[PDB]
Each structure stands twice: as C-alpha cells, then as structure tokens.
Amino acid sequence: MNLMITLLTNFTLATLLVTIAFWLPQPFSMKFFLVAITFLLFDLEIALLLPLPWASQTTNLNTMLTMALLLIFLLAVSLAYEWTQKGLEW
Amino acid sequence: MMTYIVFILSIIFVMGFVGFSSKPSPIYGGLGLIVSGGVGCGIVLNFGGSFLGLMVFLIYLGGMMVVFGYTTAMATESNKVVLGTFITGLLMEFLMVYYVLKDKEVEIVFKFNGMGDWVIYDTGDSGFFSEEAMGIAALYSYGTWLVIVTGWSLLIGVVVIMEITRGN
Amino acid sequence: MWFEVLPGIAVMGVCLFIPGMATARIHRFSNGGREKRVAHYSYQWYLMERDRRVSGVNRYYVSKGLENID
Amino acid sequence: NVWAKEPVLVASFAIAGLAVILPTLSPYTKYSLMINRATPYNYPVPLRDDGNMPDVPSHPQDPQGPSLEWLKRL
Amino acid sequence: MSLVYMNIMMAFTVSLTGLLMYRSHLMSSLLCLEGMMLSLFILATLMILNSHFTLASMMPIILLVFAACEAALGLSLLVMVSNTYGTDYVQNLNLLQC
Amino acid sequence: PGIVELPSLEDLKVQEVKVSSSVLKAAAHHYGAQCDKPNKEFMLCRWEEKDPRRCLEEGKLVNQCALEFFRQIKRHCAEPFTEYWTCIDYSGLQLFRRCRKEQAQFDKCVLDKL
Amino acid sequence: MNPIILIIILMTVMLGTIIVMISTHWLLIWIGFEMNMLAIIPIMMKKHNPRATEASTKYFLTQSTASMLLMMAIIINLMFSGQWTVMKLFNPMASMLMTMALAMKLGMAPFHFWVPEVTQGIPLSSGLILLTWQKLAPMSVLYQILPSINLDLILTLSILSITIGGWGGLNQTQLRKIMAYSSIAHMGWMTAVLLYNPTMTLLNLIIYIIMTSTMFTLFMANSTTTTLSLSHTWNKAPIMTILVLITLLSMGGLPPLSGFMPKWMIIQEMTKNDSIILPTLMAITALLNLYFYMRLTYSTALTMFPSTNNMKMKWQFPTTKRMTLLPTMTVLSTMLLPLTPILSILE
Amino acid sequence: LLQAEKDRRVLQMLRENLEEEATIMKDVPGWKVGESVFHTTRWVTPMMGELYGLRTGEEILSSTYGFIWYT
Amino acid sequence: PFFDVQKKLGVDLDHWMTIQSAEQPHRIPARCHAFEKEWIECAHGIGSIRAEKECKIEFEDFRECLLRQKTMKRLNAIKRQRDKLIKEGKYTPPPHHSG
Amino acid sequence: MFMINVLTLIIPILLAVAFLTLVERKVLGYMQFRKGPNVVGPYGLLQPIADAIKLFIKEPSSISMFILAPILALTLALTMWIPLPMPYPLINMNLGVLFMLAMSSLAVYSILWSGWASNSKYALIGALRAVAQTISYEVTLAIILLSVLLMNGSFTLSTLIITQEQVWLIFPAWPLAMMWFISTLAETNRAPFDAGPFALFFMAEYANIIMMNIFTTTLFLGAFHNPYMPELYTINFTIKSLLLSITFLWIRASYPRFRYDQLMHLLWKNFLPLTLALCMWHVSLPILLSSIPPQT
C-alpha cells in the first residue's frame, strides 16, 4: 500500500499536469520485421539467462558452468547463423 | 480500502480480458492486453510474489506487445457488435459478482466458496531464502534436460523464422 | 568562463540533494531516532513482528530492552 | 590478415576461448566448492545418539567432527 | 476451491471465446491467443506458489518462453499473408476451397 | 472424522522471554554455547515427532534456560552490553561488522569476569 | 533452404516425437508437441505459392489452439491432485479437454475441417511427414492416459470420424483430399479400439503408416494431383498401374490382402466384449469408404483413358527419381495377411 | 527459542478458536463440535484462517498481507 | 506407446521434476509433503485398480490437504452463523482481545 | 509523513529537469562559444521557469490515444526513481534492476502509441524506426547489468551499494561498463543516437536521462557510507551524478548523428559478440577466483 499509494500519486499528479496542459486553451519493409523477431528470440534467451546469479551458489558447480556456457554459446551461435546467412542486411 | 484486494484485482483482470475479447481495433486490443498483464502481475506479486510475475513483466509486457504493436503498425489499420458484446460480458461479470457476494457458493462446474479469501496462506514460516527465487535458482543445477531442449527449440525457432521470412 | 554557470549548477545540485536528505531526515524522525528495518526475507519479518508484539505499544522501535527481565 | 579485418571478433574469440579453457585447470575450484558447501542455510539436525560410533561430536566446542578453518587461514 | 481461481478460469474461457469467434482481422485472433497464454501462466503460477511446491517452479517461465516463440511463428505467418495480399483479413483466405 | 485434542489454557502459561529481537540477535553466540545443551533435545523431539502438543515440556525447559541466561547476563557484566545492543540496534538490517569494537569490549568483559 | 537446414529440421521433428514418446513429465509432452509444430511449419511452404501460405496459416491456428487447450488440461490436472506423473487424470473435465485437444490435434470429425485444406495446398513430402508423424505421436499420449477416459468421448469422436471421413470422399476428385479423407477414416478405426485393447490400435498405427507411405511414394512416381494424371501414368508406365491397384484395394481392406488385418483382429477383440451394433456399424461405413478407392481404380488401372501425345516424347527418358523405400513397403503392406500372429510382436 | 514461542502461540490461538467454535454454534442441529476434516490424527498446520478469524481487518491485514506490500 | 529409455539409461533426468519428496534445492518441503508420501507408499507396488479400491481414504485426505475446501466450508458456515447471531443480538463482540 | 516522502520524491524532479535544461543550454553554449541565457532573469533561471509557463499557455490522435501516450510517459518518469538508493531508497525492493528494464520497455510503448496516434505515414515510419532503435539496445543493457551484478550477488541493489565501498566497480569491469554507458546514450535518444504536449514528452525524456545518470553512478561507483550520517554520502553521490551529466553534455556537443543502418550494424556485429564474450567471462571467472558473492 506504500508503493500502491506512490503509484497512484504519480498517476494523479500526471493527470493533473495533463489536464492543466489541455484545459487552458479550452507498404513496409521486410527488414523492419526481422529486427522485432530477432529481438524477441534473443530477449527470450535473456529471460532464460538472467536468474543465473541467484543460482550461482550450488554444490554441482561443473554442471552449472557447463549449461551456462551452453546457453550463451547457443545465443552466440544463433547470432552467428544469422550473421553468416546475412540475416540483418540493409 | 478493505481486505479482498485479490478479488478486486481479479475483477479488473476479467474486465481487461473482456475489453479486448470484444474484438476491437487491434491497437485498442493491445492497450487492453497491457492493462490485463499489469494487473495479473499485480495479483501474482500479491500472492508473494517476490520474483516471478515481475520476471515475466519484462517479457510478456516488455517483449511481446511491443512486437504486436510493431507488426500492427506496419501491416494495416463505434460498431454495435463490439460495444454490445462488451456490455453483455460486463453484465455476466456483474451477475457473477452478485452471486459470489449475496450467496454461499458458486458453481460453474466446481464448488467455489463464496467469500474473499486470504486462505490458504503461509503461517509466517521461516524461509530466509525466498522460496520461489530459489526455485527459479534451479534449472541450472538439476535442470539438465530442460534448458537443453529449450535452447534447442529457441535455435530452431530462429532458423524457422528466417527461412519463412525468406531464407536467404 | 564557467563564472556564470555555477549558479544554475549549484541550485540544481541542491535540487538533486534534497530528496535523499529529506528521506533520511524523515526515516530518523519516524522511528524515534532509529533506522527503519529492511526485511527482505520472511525470517526478518517474523523477527520484526515479534519485536513489535513485545513492545506492547504496537511500535517496535521502543524495543523494551533488558527491563521485562524479572 | 586475421587481425586487421575483424579485430573485435578476434578479441571476442580470445577472451571466450580463455573463458572456456580456463575453468578446466585451476587451483581454486575445490575452494569454491568447499566454501559453497559449508554455509548452512537450514538447520543441522540433532540425532538420537549412536550405535556407539566414533564420530558425531557432542559438544559444539568438541574438536572431533568436520571443521571449516581456512577462512581465517587464507 | 477458492475465489480467485473461478475468476481466472472465467477470464480464460472468455479469452477462449474471443480466440474462437473472431470477425475481420487475424492479428486480434493471435493477440487473444497471447491473452490465453497469460491466463495459463497466472493460473499455474498461483497454484505453485500456494502449494509452496518450490521444486518444479520451471513451469511458468518455460511455458511463457515457449508460447512466446509460438507467437513469434504466428507473427511471421501473419506478416507473410499481409505481404502476399493487401491486408490481413479473414477474406483473401477464401481461396483453396474445401 | 475424529476430533482433535489439545492441552488447555492452564498448561500454556509459561513465562516467556519478553525481551526484544535486536538484543536477542546481539547476544546470539554465547547463548549458543553457554545454554543450548538441552534445546537440541527440544529440536530432536520436534523433528522426530512433528506434533507440537507432544514436545512442549522441552519448550518450557528451554524457556527457563534462556530466562536464567538473561538473568545471569543482566545482574553482572556488562552494563555497556546495553550500549552494545543499542549500537547494533539502529544499524538497519543487522551486521556484525559495523558495531564491532563494542563487541570486543563485551567479549573482554566476559572473558575476564566469567 | 539448405540440405543442412532440412536435415536439422527433420532431426527436430524426430526429436519432438521422441520427447513425446519418452518422457514422464507433462511439461515435456507439451514442449514436444510445440517443437513438432514449430519445425513442421517450414516443411510446408517449400514453394511459395499462396496455397501453402493459407494452408500453413490454417494449420498453425488450429494446432496452436489445440496445444494451449492441452496445457489447460494439464493445469486443471494440477489444480486437482498435484504431481507431474503422466498417468490417470483426476477430473473428468481434464480428461474431456485433453481428448478434445487430441481430437483437434490429429483430426476428428468435429475438428477435422483443416485436414483436407492443409493437405491440398502443399507438396506431397510435407503431407507425408504430417500424416505419418503427426498421427503417430499423440497416439502415444492416448496410450499413456487410457485408464481415465470417459468412453463416450472416444466413441462419439470415433464413429463420427468414420462416417464423416466416409461421406467426404465421394465428391473429391483431388488426390490429396481423397488421401486426407482416408486419413480421417483410419483415425476412426485407430481410435475406437482404444479403451479395450490398445495393442490393436498401435498395430493399426503401424499398418496405416506403412500403407500411406506406399501411397505417397506411388504418387511421387510422378507429380500427380488429379486422377487424369494417373491415367497418363498408365500410358507412361505399366507397373505403377498394378501397384496402384494392389495398394488401393489394400487401403480398401479385402481379406486376401494385408489391409484386412486392421479390421479383422479389431472386430475380434472388440466383440469379445459385447459391443456388436457398434462394430457392425463401423464395418458398414468401412464398406462405404472403399468406393472412392474403387472409382480411382476404375479410372486408371482397369479401364484405359484417352491420352495425349508428347507421352511419345516421354517414353525415351527414365522415371529417374530415387523411390525412397518402395518395394519393401509394397510387399510388406500387401502380402502380410498370413502373419496376423505378428500382432503380439508389440508388447 | 522462537520456535518454542511460536508453538505456544499457535496452540493458544487454536485453543481460543476451538473454544469459540464451541460457543458460537451452541444450538445448531447436525454438527459435531470439533470435527477435524482429516482421517489421520497427525498435526495439520492450519491455514491462517483458523489462526486468524473474526478479527475484522487490522491484525489479519497487518499479519498476512502486511509483509508483501511492506518493504 | 511409451518407452523406458529413462529407465534403461539409469540417469533419472526427469524423475526429479516430477513429485515432491525429492531433492528440493535447499531441503525444504512443500505444504502437503506427508500426504503425498503416505499416498504414494499406499499405492506403490499396487496394480492401479485395487489401488483405487484401497487407497481412496488417503487420496481424499491428500486432496483435502491441497484444496482445504471442506475446511473452508466449515469456516464459512461458522462465519455466516456469526454474522446472523451478531445481527440478531448475542454478544456485541468480545471474542477477540477481551476473553 | 509518508505522503511528504512522496511529494519530496516526485515534485523536485520537475525542478531538477527544468534546471537541467538551463544547465545543458548554458554549458553547451560555453562549449560552443556562447554566453546565454543571461538576459531574462539573473544568470538564466527565470528564463526556464518562463519557458515552462509559456509552453503551458499556448493554444494548440483519438483523444484516448492522444492522451494515453504522454500520461504513460510521465508516469514512468515519476515512478522510476523508486528504488535508487540515495542512501535510504523510498521502497526497499528486493529486486529492482528488473524493474528498471521493465519500465524502459514501457517507455517503448509510449513512443509507439504516440507514433500511431500521430496518423501520418512519414511520422509513422519515423516512429517505427525509433521504436526499433530504442528496443535494439535493451538486450545489451540487460546482459551487462546481469554481469555487473553477478559480481555482487543479488538484485537488491542495497547489497550493491554495500559492495562498492572497497573499490569502484568501474575498475573490475571497465569495457563492460563503457558499453553500458554507450547503451545509455542509445536509450536516452540523444545525439549521436537518433505533435504534443511537448512539455510532457520532453519532460519524460529528460527525467529518463537523469535516471540513467543516477543509475550509472549507483551501479558503478560511489562513496563510503558514513554510519548515522548519510548527508556526506548524498553530497558526493550527487556531485558524481552531476559530473557524469556534464560528461554526457560533453559527449553530446561534439558528434554527428549516426546513419540508422550504421547504428544497427554497429550494435549487432560490434557490441553483441563483445558483450557476450565479456559476460561469459564474468560467468566462468568468479568461480575460478574462489569468489562467489553471497546472496544472503
């Protein structure tokens, strides 16, 4: 309720400022699309990666090391595949 | 200003899903789905709630509706049916709220105890390591097979996307 | 030179200084002089909760130390 | 040659190659494992005493059992 | 059961009806599939948190990354349709008749 | 189904350590060594039988042990132990590295006198 | 495409089916179905006509809503009795939505409209892989969840699938819609036995897959879409005629021929129950679907149509594909009547 | 030490609330008076509605949901 | 069908995700641990149908652990009778903080 | 009193933004060659107050979309100084860096909505490309943030401000920090990396800028935290944030805008292998130096 109250105050002051700001007068490109899906897939691999530092204290350090390097290596390999296959040209 | 804030936020959640299930213009739909995902994240962050909804808040509300609005803006661009279905969905919401409140139980095909419920809930037990965060801090010791097939399906999704969008 | 730009920079440096200093002022003012607790985990929440229970005044900062012994 | 055309690519492969190869050989991974093992999250249980076993020290100052000591001893 | 579970399932089935019956565009249909993804996510997450079933906490995040790449495949297909025609209507699919 | 049985109210009046939490963390270790020879009996009862309403008498025994321990530390050295726990008291989430010199003072107290 | 890329994608379709066959955890089943979908889309649209774009669009929408409905069934299962063991469910509602998820998955008569549409608008290789593997893998799921099925589900979906896949097929002159209607007919035969003795269903699965592989290799003898093209296959080659004859009547299932082993043993260990009206109705509709097989036979291998010059020009050249595995599957799909005691090879 | 105090407090609230379940339904028909729902007499941990009932707002909000939107 | 490569290769690489009563990552249980352990040890070496004949009691006990629906039913009946008696006029409430 | 905490948090940031406008105009003049503004008002402070007043006076879609773009931009600008530990942060979020990423994504939403409601195809394709180059750097920002807190254990960021007492964290990852700072330049939408109410839109932009400056100063360096006297820490922290903001001006006033395809080509094929290699080195290496940080 602390941060709910703060969030609500931000919303109310922003609406107050908007109402003061308002009341006082009164074909495409295919290359656009690949950027979005490239972001979407690398952002999903981000979503897998980023809870790593919570995990970084285990007793099976070798397994965590190997699968962590597997994840980043696959991310770089997908980058390498679109790199060799001219995936972001312009 | 009272106890049943989970039920209240769940009412706003059902409001949002109805508000884009009435098939609007798709950017009105994207607005409604952003509001729906925000209050669902609020709900899960109210059931404690430390991590996982906020984790997906980046992804589902940080990496999905952006791409939907993107591909809506570069594809294409009031009516009685949309507004009528919205009002009737709101009416079914109103009727289900009424049968929760002024009765004992509600059955669709279940039995739901009709009262706002903090129950069930933890009895203040000593975690000290924030249980769901260490649950997500699995997949990296025990999770051998799962991240292997997950990253593999990610790589196959990459090559599939580029091939369908004209490899090469 | 910079002889007429340090007024604006100084005033804006005060205007960035003020919320942290006011927040620390209010954190000390609203605890009887203590520091506000920070329970990241449920264990520190339970410890803080029994602390505010045994103060009697529903206010944990009092902390009733070594006086309800015997 | 190999360096002038794509320099940051070579530097990235170099630091990636050492970040793969170097976790094999190190004099410190056993220390990482022992430090990571010996930090008790949960509660180490008391047990019904023994079948007259020459282990499980009774007093928490009795030096029979397993001990972490090299934190002070580097 | 509870009170929250009935409302989340009601939201799910309304999202399912919005997925099934759909009038003019396909983007709104795939977007309702995304909403159904959200509903399954929230449902499984609140189940696992209320159980304190800490072990298989993989379910919600891996469910969502996978149904996310499902939506990525869908957006690729929809943009392919809108390339090879003018719009993304349910019309222009009237050929290849049964 | 079968109905439960509990001990009544006249079994659950045992005088409790009505001290705060900051001091209770501040005197942790020497409580862990001086007393707490019989609390592991309570812990063994609690793990081998996960039924409170069976093990509570060992809870009474550890209650009176801890009360005797705080009696012993109150009526003797140290009085600047009170300054020690109120020094660790205002330091947010509690660290043992911040208010350290008074911890060494309290330790010199307890090693000399007791 | 690259051949590297296709060997990777076929490896992933195989990987999805092996994960579905192999696991004891419901999330792995769902990921298997999804990965199978994800990889099976670019086997379609090997060309780039709008036919394949629309067909893959329809297949994607139906398949993805089936997968999300399956995940709904799993989540209901764990709202109830909570464990990830692939076994008996604990809700008739969960079993209901799960059977309807599979009925949208592999094609049953309420849910079957996408199958002829998607099989016409693609080349034959994509149709081959989709029919064979996409109808192989969810039968494993049914074999794992057989003890907790309301039989009215499988009964209704099975009977209705047999009769719809029968009655569709009298009008279609396109080869691929004929083959998809035959597919729904065998899905009815492969599903109605399931709550009685599933060894029958898995043997029927192996039979149907071998038959349909023979059929698509014979329609890859040259790229044919109507029946008229098969009359020209008569004029250019004599032995493709007699193999279309034998394999079409084995799809029909006559007792001297190996397509009768699915009907025969299933009627046997169906009526060692006392369902009799249901088997005899199923066998009457099995008589019905043989008609379009028979009119294809009458069109090409038995009568002879008028034909066209430049087939004179085609006489010189070899039909020099490699047939992938034609002869083994032919005489293993047709002459395998006297080995019905290889039923019990299975378990 | 805290575990012993927590045992005594939860047994105290259970005794209070079963005494008041015996009072609050003093004349209703049917109704055995102390029905555990289960079939095995073990120690259930209750579900924070029997630990905290009839409190009207203050302790239930500031003792269940207080931590989550606190800090 | 279903194969047993999970069994023959021996490494139970998926039987850790499956149920409770395993290596939860730091050794804590769930809420309904002992119910699951009792029901599993009820129906372990049993042929899944006389399990349904003779493990019904503990399985209902487990479902009442997980859902606690009957306990909520009793609790709601208590609260609605509390409401009707406090509306009708017996003990303007002392049952909290003043016994 | 908590409402007074709220008002002292979210009101003086607007005065901070206005005086940032005067500071950036003055210092960019003294870079270029310009006194000014020094005429209206003593040394130019009444001049920005009058700037905001005059822009409020003037008399200038789908009023739904037309209002919901700047309302979201400015409520992001308000909400996004919640967990920044000016020593006592306003809400002690147990995880806040993921909240930083999520609200950057919400800013992407705001720009896309205003571009859709602009309703003219040249502004539409311009806003589309700006969305793509805003979203193209939240990858790198996320992964560098991951590697810099992996050296420090937990998402809490108060543990981070503990751990930067010994060394400034700019030393044990300098190229990683440099690449994060270039990505902050990209996310702020300024040079080199590139209709109303412009007051609100402008305001949200500059508040996001000062947020990234303060988050840079907290994430990478700082001062020693005095027990029971945080005023000295606040002073040295604020002066470091201001020197980095002047450095941000100093980078502004000297470089041309990139070509857009050069920007994307540079991001992918120049940051993205180098960030990945540095991040896998910060994965594999603290397990090799006997040093994994204590998540508490």
Author numbering:
A (entry chain D3): 1 to 26, 50 to 113
B (entry chain D6): 1 to 77, 85 to 175
C (entry chain A1): 1 to 70
D (entry chain A3): 10 to 83
E (entry chain 4L): 1 to 98
F (entry chain A8): 1 to 114
G (entry chain D2): 1 to 347
H (entry chain AM): 73 to 143
According to the publication:
In mammalian heart mitochondria, the majority of CI is found in association with CIII2 and CIV (SC I+III2+IV; respirasome) or in association with CIII2 alone (SC I+III2).
Initial 3D classification identified four classes of SC I+III2 particles. In all other classes of SC I+III2, these loops were disordered, suggesting that they are distinct forms of the open state (or deactive form) of CI (Blaza et al., 2018, Fiedorczuk et al., 2016). We identified striking changes in TMH3 of ND6 between the open- and closed-state structures. The ordered ND3 TMH1-TMH2 loop in the closed state crosses directly above ND6 TMH3. Additional large conformational changes were seen in this area: the short three-stranded β sheet of NDUFS2 that harbors the β1-β2 loop was adjacent to ND6 TMH3 in the closed state but rotated away from TMH3 by as much as 10 Å in the open states.
